[PDB]
């Protein structure tokens, strides 16, 4: 499978999800309680609760180095004060919700936690000397920055040239509509020629010009939780390296072309973007088991999905649209095609290298979105999630908070629509 | 009054907002049209319709150098292709929608479109040179950049100190809760103390973490149209300069103390943000005729409003909470009180530097949002608008798409709600 | 005032509104509960939850013979099974919701709960015997039956003739359009001429073909509660008797002319029907406290209202359009005019037989519906209601179902709308 | 197939769908135009247009006997006045929309237009003498009446006894949930014992007590248009006859038991009722071709459908739940099961007698409702349809009328839901 079990750092990450009502002593109480225990107060951030006017939300920017007193604080918090605390832990210790980044800026803690001799071009010291350099670029990037741009060598340029020569000529009849729609634009705007390599930054900015989707330089393949969690933030982690000039149509681990020809152009569609994003949102705080299940879904859908299209069936898989041979295989009559169903799609085993025998076809991305949200209602976590586009932080919602926020949001949509009724 | 009519630049600003449905030649026709007539493509960016999968949307960043060629382009768009074209013009000539920005970045285009001997300290060279310094800072600032942090002199530090000493001790009973709650946060977080000035950047970061609202350093005062459009983007144009030490409770032009102590803390509540933003949206495409009325609203609502608050009447005006005398004058039997109703609230003359005879009271900011939106449904503009938080572009909507977009979005929201109903 | 407090019958009316979720024994438990304690099943009807597939809804048609046994049943329902029970009582004792009908057929239960020497014609035996005749007709009429058609004497025919002669010639400029349009229809269709009386049955048929509104022959005057509940069912309780020939423009108790010329023609517009019906629904479960206010509304709105109508102010009141003098008094500079706002419109004392000093003006009936519904959201009753047009039973809604039912219904409506958008 | 081509009567039915704006001369113009041409004015009914306050709708109760002048009237109507007229014709003559009943009362014109020697019990004069008697009962029924009740013979009673003995014992594990839910209620309420025959009227009234669904006595099998059109009105036409005592488990033409055990109990569920009803609504004014397609759908769904149910697949077909042998066959592993899709389901051929080889399974009835409405968007008719629950007439909607009615209806639902947001 494509599931990669997740890791941790020795310091770790112990966050405390809790909101607090402006009670007698409260905001003084908490921050003094922390600075008595040596906890830095650059790391105890509090902002208001966007729902109950009289409450705040608290973000604790910590690690396991605070353990000699982190017990005690929790002790006082849940039982001496009466604040509902959920602890995020990356070590996945005693019945502790699995850690995840909480703001779009917290992605830098565990973004470099990725990656055999048989790699194509292995005994070439040149390709490896280039590969550690590109990993370095991902090692030094911090959120907010523009992606540092690299002049690509030319042998790599014609590797892309060949792959593009094949795939372009073959997309017009193989790719989904939303791909033939975006791709001419990428060509004329970003530098998506068969004779030119685009820089990650420009593509990032274009995807933000279409959907607010962002490209983040990652050295390699991250653990499923981190990958799908970053996708929650409308952030796609992508690679900067190319395949070897010897074998331009096989890579065991995804390269520049897989993203630019498999993922990105569809990331320029809002319907598909939100589709992927909802899965992202659902991935966080989820059990490792359900992360295996998410990985399975992602594979048979994002990486290798098909879409019903009025008259045709077409491929929206990112591995489908990036691998010339399997893009031939896919619409051939060989493989299996059935209307997508997650009850089975999760319980669907697959292979990593071999051409995937069976495929699953959606109606439109939005129906798949509905289905994803449905399955999200199945993942067991003692709270809900929903993403804030402006603040770029994930609203962790409880019983009472889901209610007023959805209520009034739909009220505003209701108002604008009721005015749309008056022509 | 404080209403300011809008002006133009030598270059100008000619946009052609139009979308086009993907037929063979359509987008080819347009991109042919520009470079056939030599128009630069540094400014003609076309992206997909975030709504109709089969359409593109066109933002044309143009100017009056296209006047030597715009006739032909308009004609071919309106009649040879059949595209509904709305031309945005800042010259506001025959059949021209009054210009406004479509991108979060088009606010830098008209950020320098701003701004007397009786000022206390007019011939004081130090206050003059410092005001030219701050005008320079606002002159060269472009969106996305960090707000440069400025070292304040001591006279300015204690002028702020005095203003704060007076107003802070008073707020506990005059400001709305949404202020009495937020201010404890701002004090200890951004530096809203009596002996220290926060730098706009830090406050901006706080405000986007709360509401996606942003602080923009602006020279003097910008036309009503431009100010309120920037507020539509959840971007607040704000001042970095301080008042003179001679008269610490009189400033003719809004200053650091007025912005940080009158406006910001209320900009820290989402409900208030939605209120102001909905007004902003109503400003876009609006004629100067009803923009006089809009400025009036802002005055009597954001700057000089009162709000029903459970038991009492309280001040949420940014000018009430920034001018010490009128905050008491307003909470007395002296002034007159009228229930906010836009039939009258817009139609009401006023003066700027005056203890306001009458005030207007809201119920909660949300209902005020509703009233603003309702009255906005009355301004005649040949389309409505609503802002895309991720892309930071305002979806300009015609008849056909408004319904499909809100209908389906609410389809998703009500689905998740119907499933949440079963606990 | 014209407000009438409600009374009770010797039998009474004890309903227990409750639904129950289909577990083994649940519905078995209840049906066991009744016949274990001997209660008759001519009145205990259980039907499915039109909303939650897995639940039943229970309408229990009971009386005070169950007082010798209701204690046990209530207890077992509230604590041994765990069913949310709301008991409807017309005795309105401790912890009793004030009684109201759940079925379109429960209106016959309290249809005889109605009704002086100074009447012109009091000791006239002919008018007396005729009023006892019409009271008998209303006494034995049950819903569903055809309204018996009655042969009128000649004095009654020309009393009607005179009233009509006067008011008809005048309506062309005093009544709302929704009256000036409908009346041409009623004249030629039902027999609304100066020489002929329509029989309630024919008008009823007309009114259900327009609005589902129905004419019910009622003896004298029914308590405010009962009248307005019947109006909730889109059923109008109406009079079949005429006034005396002595005073053709004075009647203390509403008569055929008042109903057919004041009320009905406006009951022929759907928007007005929705207005009155929403009020009706608000009456259900309402305490007498706010029902005084409801009666006041009906008076100042349905019976004595004015409406903004594009350019002018016009009368849609049923008492304005039925009492010739006050229709002119009202359209003059004599009376006072106040914009309909329920904060004041409910809170306002009045007298019955009086040229009304002040009047209230609406914008359109639909907005008045909104205001009624809004103020209804203020009455404290332990559930909301909305009427099922096909079943002719009012869905009594608790928290959990309201959302799933309207959410999904609107899901369907917005789907068909989104598909209609493409022409 | 189960499609039966439709017939006509010699008089026929020429109706004219048109609305009219209150223009100079209008309402006098039309009715005088008709009475000049001998057209009875009991047959020219006009009521108001429920949308445009200034318009009426006109129903012409005619036949082909008006032909010697029906040309001329149409002549003046469409081209001399400018009223959009759509002619309904049952003969399906020159490009004339196929006739259908317009009110729930117009069903009596063509309700008796139904129905080989091999019928079971044919040479028994007793069964035929009974069969013409039951057809007579359907021949003499007119809308509004209660269904005349018959004392059933006893041999027929034990035919029902045997069929019930088998099917009841076999339903608890074969029938869909919504059947095991309703059926105990029918047992205890209507007289659904294995030892007793229910009278059509009581079942009708029960189905109206659940969903407003009604049972109308029909002599035999009607043409598809009339059957599905009656189902639009929430009216199910049903048979009063039984099978022969010789062979109680085979009938070529549906009998009492098929409805009471196949159709009715599901007609007591609102979700299923609306499901069937929307198809009904869609059937009217549809091409004969698409009536063949509708018949196909009805067969594979209503008569022989399955439903996905969380854990199981269960039968909701009316022939499935009425035929003991095929109810065994259905969940056996023999037949084919695929997720229902109307693109194919219509183009799905079948057999009349033989056990249907393949079956189609829905998720829940509502999803099938969505699908039906979707396919309805494909039937070609120059107007839309939507059913009025109160007036019990089908709103024929044009471009402009669909808009305001759906707009404001959803506005009301929006209001009630927005108030549900305030708890
Ligand atoms: C989601 C699933 O685990 C899938 O294999 C992930 C794994 N990690 C990844 N890591 C990177 N860098 N890029 C990817 O596309 C993926 N895909
Ligand atoms: C909104 C209203 O027009 C008000 O007068 C505006 C005018 N332009 C402005 N310009 C600046 N720089 N600052 C302000 O506060 C205002 N206020
Ligand atoms: C609705 C208001 O309470 C008003 O006084 C009611 C009272 N009861 C009534 N009873 C009858 N029979 N007829 C009426 O018009 C009224 N009006
Ligand atoms: C809808 C389809 O035509 C189906 O065979 C109809 C035909 N006519 C009918 N006629 C009657 N009386 N009852 C039915 O169930 C049907 N079914």
Oligomeric organization of the protein chains: homotetramer
Note the main sheet of chain A. 5 strands, mixed
Number of strand segments of chain A: 13
Give the number of domains of chain A: 1
Which molecules are bound besides the chains? 5,6,7,8-tetrahydrobiopterin
The ordered H/E elements of chain A are EHEEHEEHHHHEHEHHHEEHEHEHEEH
Task: Output the radius of gyration of chain A.
Answer: 23 Å
Helix content of chain A: 40-55%
CATH architecture of chain A: Orthogonal Bundle
Strand content of chain A: 5-15%
Distance between the termini of chain A: 53 Å
What fold name stands as the CATH topology of chain A?
Phenylalanine Hydroxylase
Looking at CATH, the homologous superfamily of chain A is Aromatic amino acid hydroxylase
Element layout with pairings:
The structure is a homotetramer.
Chain A: E1 14-21, H1 26-36, E2 44-48, E3 55-60, H2 67-81, E4 86-89, E5 97-98, H3 125-140, H4 154-171, H5 177-190, H6 200-210, E6 214-217, H7 224-232, E7 235-238, H8 256-267, H9 270-283, H10 288-303, E8 305-309, E9 312-315, H11 324-331, E10 336-339, H12 342-345, E11 358-362, H13 365-376, E12 384-387, E13 394-397, H14 399-421
Parallel strand pairs in A: 4-5, 6-7, 8-11, 10-11
Antiparallel strand pairs in A: 1-3, 1-4, 2-3, 8-9, 12-13
Helix pairs in contact in A: 7-9, 9-13
The complex binds 5,6,7,8-tetrahydrobiopterin (H4B) (4 copies).
One 5,6,7,8-tetrahydrobiopterin binds near residues 224 and 227 of chain D.
Keywords (chains A, B, C, D): Allosteric enzyme, Disease variant, Iron, Metal-binding, Monooxygenase, Oxidoreductase, Phenylalanine catabolism, Phenylketonuria, Phosphoprotein
GO biological process, one term (chains A, B, C, D): catecholamine biosynthetic process
Cofactor (chains A, B, C, D): Fe(2+)
